[PDB]
Amino acid sequence: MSSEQIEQFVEEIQRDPALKEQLQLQGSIDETIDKVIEIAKEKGYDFTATELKEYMENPSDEEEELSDSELEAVAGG
């Protein structure tokens, strides 16, 4: 799977409120990655690189996390 195809998969999730809510239910980045793997699995997308944590491990926003706490928490949005 190409990086463009991966981006298309990401878009599908971003444009699906139901899947967004699922990602909001997840807390850590690892949990987020696990979820989108499940999404890819059900839909039939190649999540090899995702499983390897090469893609979809961080936001595209340039804004950096300013949180001081190093504890895990439920994702907002």
Domain layout of the chain by residue ranges:
3-51
* Number of Cα atoms under 13 Å in the Cβ half of residue 39: 22
Q: How many other C-beta atoms lie within 10 A of the C-beta of residue 39?
A: 19
Experimental method: NMR
Euclidean distance between CA atoms 67 and 49, whole angstroms: 28
Short-list 32, 65, 67, 46, CA closest to 4: 46
CA separation, residue 68 to residues 27, 54, 55, 65 (Å): 16, 26, 25, 9
Phi, psi of 57 (to 5 degrees): -125, -5
